[PDB]
């Protein structure tokens, strides 16, 4: 369903993409674009679990 | 509402001498003189200085106030006609039949002669207004240059040429043939 | 009512970055694309902050606040036309190496 603690890898293997703020913004770019498909993103659809850590849910301030 | 007073300011460049007497405007510039009668409008004129003229309407209603900036624009067009000239460029638009355009002179009059328009055997003739110069562009293929001091005559001759080439009994979205005004500018480039 | 709040956030973050670093010079651009601007801030993650906005808001929002941070005053008549801001503190050479690097021209 992913992350599978690897959605950061999809962001750091696509490290040359979003010219964001500090790495974690790149993780949000895949968040927005993978919402368009629509599968098992932790149960529902994105633009929801995105907006959790977009405001602040668990913890991804990865360095 | 009968606005108590409405004003517009003409601007006269350095080499131009506007001359107004009893609503008959005579504008003189390096390129010549143009005259226009405005006796059909109720306006008054004040010479502010040699480079500016105030144009005033007193106690005018909505339409009579509306007629003030048009007076301003006409005199400004006269000024730029006698200080810069006018130039309209026309492009010949045809899909199949080439338009054969000549500048002929019959009975002492200049004419624009259009032949083979949409294959017709008819010969179209458009009278060239006085003060208007026609030229077939050498630098451009299928281009006619209409030039002169008076914007009204130049644009009306250009419109005559465009209008005589209207398409009948066809889908004019498909049959786009004709002679169309492509550029409206001045003789002196700016 | 939403415009005056984005205006307030604009002044809030205008003054948040004013005291965090310091002095700034002339910074004018023109015919600069959206992709053109993303390149400078891509290599300037942390050593600089690319402040942006417009002109008329910036001039007055500081001119009236010349009480908590006066000093400028006569420094405002410099703001003309298409001008941005790069908020940092380095040296007259150390920033022009990392900023002037990308240029796009035309015939």
């Amino acid at each position: 369903n992913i992350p599978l603690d690897e959605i950061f890898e999809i962001a750091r293997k696509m490290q040359h993409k979003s010219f964001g703020k500090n790495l974690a913004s790149v993780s949000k770019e895949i968040l927005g674009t993978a919402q368009s498909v629509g599968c098992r993103v932790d149960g529902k659809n994105p633009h929801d679990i995105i907006d959790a850590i977009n405001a602040g849910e668990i913890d991804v301030p990865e360095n | 509402m009968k606005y108590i007073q409405t004003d517009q300011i003409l601007d006269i460049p350095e080499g131009v001498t506007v001359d107004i007497k009893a609503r008959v405007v005579k504008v003189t510039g390096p390129r010549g003189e143009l005259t226009k009668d405005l006796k059909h409008i109720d306006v008054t004129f004040n010479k502010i200085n040699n480079r500016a003229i105030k144009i005033t309407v007193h106690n005018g209603d909505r339409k009579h106030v509306a007629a003030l900036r048009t007076v301003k624009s006409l005199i400004a067009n006269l000024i730029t006609g006698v200080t810069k000239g006018y130039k309209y460029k026309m492009r010949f638009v045809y899909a199949h039949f080439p338009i054969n355009v000549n500048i002929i002179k019959k009975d002492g009059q200049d004419y624009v002669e259009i032949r083979n328009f949409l294959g017709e055997k008819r010969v179209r003739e458009v009278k060239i207004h006085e003060g208007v110069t026609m030229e077939i562009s050498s630098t451009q293929k299928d281009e006619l240059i209409v030039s002169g001091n008076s914007l009204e005559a130049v644009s009306q001759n250009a419109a005559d040429i465009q209008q005589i080439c209207r398409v009948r009994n066809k889908d004019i979205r498909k049959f786009l043939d004709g002679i169309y005004v492509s550029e409206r500018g001045t003789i002196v480039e700016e | 009512g939403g415009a005056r709040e984005k205006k307030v956030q604009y002044f809030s973050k205008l003054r948040e970055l004013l005291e965090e670093y310091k002095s700034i010079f002339v910074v004018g651009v023109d015919n600069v694309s959206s992709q053109q601007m993303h390149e400078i801030r891509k290599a300037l993650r942390g050593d600089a902050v690319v402040l942006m906005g417009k002109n008329t808001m910036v001039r007055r929002a500081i001119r009236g606040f010349l009480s908590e941070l006066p000093e400028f005053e006569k420094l405002l008549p410099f703001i003309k036309g298409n001008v941005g801001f790069i908020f940092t503190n380095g040296d007259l050479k150390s920033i022009r190496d990392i900023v002037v690097s990308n240029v796009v021209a035309a015939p």
Partner: protein
């Protein structure tokens, strides 16, 4: 041709109420017969009183305070049209309060076909400040150093025939 009247009246005293409250209205009427008539028209729109159960106490003309001082008046109106009932506010230039109301009656007759019977005057106020003037058709006469000519003068002749060419200078 109108005058401004102060009309004061009251309910007839009863043994229950021997001094009912006195109510005053400022009435713009051509004469004192209509001033007391209009008074009862408005009291019955507001107070449980009638002409049969009431009494007119005083009718007095209110003259202009400065009849040779040029003023701008704002008039608040409530008039009836063919379809509904409307509130309106308009402004007039005149030297007397009465003369502004006379212009008002002519003005709503011409642009809204509102007859005298269709109009209620809510309030007439003299506008002290130039910032109090909201309407542009009277604000244009408050500009500094106002000058304007009167072009195209038509002279009224006593005779049918004139031996010289007509002119319109002035």
């Amino acid at each position: 041709r109108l005058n401004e009247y102060q009309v004061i009246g009251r309910n007839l005293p009863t043994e229950s109420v021997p001094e009912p409250k006195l109510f005053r209205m400022r009435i713009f009427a051509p004469n004192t017969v209509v001033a007391k008539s209009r008074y009862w028209y408005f009291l019955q729109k507001l107070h449980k009183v009638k002409k049969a159960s009431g009494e007119i106490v005083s009718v007095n003309i209110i003259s202009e305070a400065k009849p040779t001082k040029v003023k701008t008046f704002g008039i608040w109106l409530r008039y009836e049209s063919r379809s509904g009932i409307h509130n309106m506010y308009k402004e007039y230039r005149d030297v007397t309060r009465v003369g502004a109301v006379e212009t008002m009656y002519q003005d709503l007759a011409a642009r809204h076909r509102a007859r005298f019977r269709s109009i209620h005057i809510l309030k007439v106020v003299e506008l002290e400040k130039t910032d109090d003037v909201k309407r542009q058709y009277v604000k244009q006469f408050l500009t500094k150093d106002l000058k304007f000519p009167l072009p195209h003068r038509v002279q009224k002749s006593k005779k049918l025939f004139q031996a010289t060419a007509p002119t319109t200078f002035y």
